[model samples]
Target: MDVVIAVGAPLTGPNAAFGAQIQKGAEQAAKDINAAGGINGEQIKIVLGDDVSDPKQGISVANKFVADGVKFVVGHFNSGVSIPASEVYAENGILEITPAATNPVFTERGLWNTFRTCGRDDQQGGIAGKYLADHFKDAKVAIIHDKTPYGQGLADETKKAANAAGVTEVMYEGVNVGDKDFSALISKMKEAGVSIIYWGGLHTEAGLIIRQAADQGLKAKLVSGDGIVSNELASIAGDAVEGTLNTFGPDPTLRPENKELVEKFKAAGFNPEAYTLYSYAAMQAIAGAAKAAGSVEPEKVAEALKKGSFPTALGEISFDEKGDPKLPGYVMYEWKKGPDGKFTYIQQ
Candidate 1:
């Protein structure tokens, strides 16, 4: 019936809680589709595979998906996890449609079953590079990244694009993925008179550095790639996060086409932020493809998916030849203080 789907993502580790958005949006999509008579009139079901943000654990989740006979998957949110875990899925002929993993490598390496609803890091970082070169023409730029694949890869791409755009960084630095302190790095940045900091890391470490930089009175502004989209950054750094710039996919929750789903998410006590609607779109795409192909078999659905365009809560999406979504462009968002005692991104 093309009914059952799974989400593979971190659920109980450092990147743990962010999985909720993927799961909730996926579940809601299934619920809505089922209520509307489902894909080909069969009810949709959802399962989850908690990979804990580790590659080995993601593989374990893939094994579990195999054991559970999951037809399709919606995640493995980290590029590191998605890359390796997708090998497992590909080998098994199962579909993996990631909602947020942005590394171009996820879809670039001929993994037949790998697809994503998000823009690649190359695209995002390129946009960020141009923005820095365009907006901070006379300002000293510093580029820093956590030394993991996603962080380093994104930083490298952005730096390359920026350099090509005549915006060479005053300092390019590497920091460990989970490091708590950045005072030394902050001191170096301060000494370099860097006015703009481009960070490629998850929210936790970036939040700490931003907060610590503020504590030390560093006047530099931060510009981060999509890895920093989590709302956790605001809570981790409080007002210190208020002016940070992030480059990510255009806000799906704000799309007029998604208004009802946005309210539905709010009514369900979910914020629908970050990758929520993206995950929902992934499910909708698969279901649409299945019906268009008239088969639930993996190959047929995959082919149908590659060739099909479908309307979703996030609007219409179609897959390119490389299994990446086309036209899911990037935008700049600013985290500013909101009255709800939280800092959140508003498109700028």
Candidate 2:
């Protein structure tokens, strides 16, 4: 059997829907590559593993990929899981191209084998901060986090940017995950006269905050990072999700050039969301680099990937020395209902 690419993510856990989407995208990419005579005439295959969104499981999956001698890895979404999982891949000198993990430290550790297809928290935080500062001037802002490294780091960075941008009355705070009661937090925000709130967390906590704020009759504007940009948020927050602002990696399905791929994805029963295109692009990049290098060796492919540029379903892709994708700009989205009775991404 030829060497196969290993793709890992939470395919069956809390974020199963998104995981499945990632898998679908990668699978499609692999199939397309193989149909085009494979990479260097060697059949390209994708071997998948489920991390179940658990850090321990992510590490275990990484070890398994190393044991299987897989050269390219596609994922392990959440930064919490990717952080620990990357250590094992790094030790084995395996190149991991994460499609969704955005925490800055994932690449900051000087790991040569680790790369992400998305922007880091600091980049996202800076964008969000600038948007708020320019649009909602003189508004009191409350920054909240879920206390995880991804959430807290982004919140702190955003707060710093907001402060530097001359936004006054900025307050930073934290909240525990899975907490049900946010009445106290709501009351505090109300008392503080907070007019704008930035939440550095995932959809679960963001939904809760929005719902609680609505219940408390707080009219503050709610904003969040890429973590909260999902259809799941609509299910959790209901009407409360309406008018919520968030920044996410660019929407992939919006490109006119990708219309064919979008049609194919819909035919395959996938949503073709941002992460899906990103994951597909990562796989395409890996296959192209491996072919260009004329070998499946990790070091060679990593070098090829860094030096070679390729066209992806998302756009043209190239990597910096740090293994971060060279693509820039994050999109601002507002949660709104469409005629189909589903939450849709509206550019802000």
In candidate 1, which residue pairs get closer than 3 Å at backbone N, Cα or C atoms, i.e. clash? 8-76
Best by lDDT: 1
lDDT of candidate 1 vs native? 0.86
The residue-by-residue lDDT of candidate 1 on 1-348, one tens digit each, is 546788888877777657888888899999898898898778877888898888888888899998888888999788999998888888887898999899889998987798888889889889999888888878899999988789989999899888988898999999987778788999999998988999987888888988999998789889997777778788788788988998988888878888888898899898888888898999898889989999777778889988978888767888888998876589998898666757888888
Model 1 scores worst on lDDT over the 10 consecutive residues at 9-18
Error of 2 at 91 (Å): 1.4
* Candidate 2: segments with Cα more than 4 A from true spot: none
Indicate the residue-level lDDT of 196 in model 1. Answer: 91
Residue pairs that clash (backbone atoms under 3 angstroms), model 2? none
TM-score of each: 0.96, 0.95
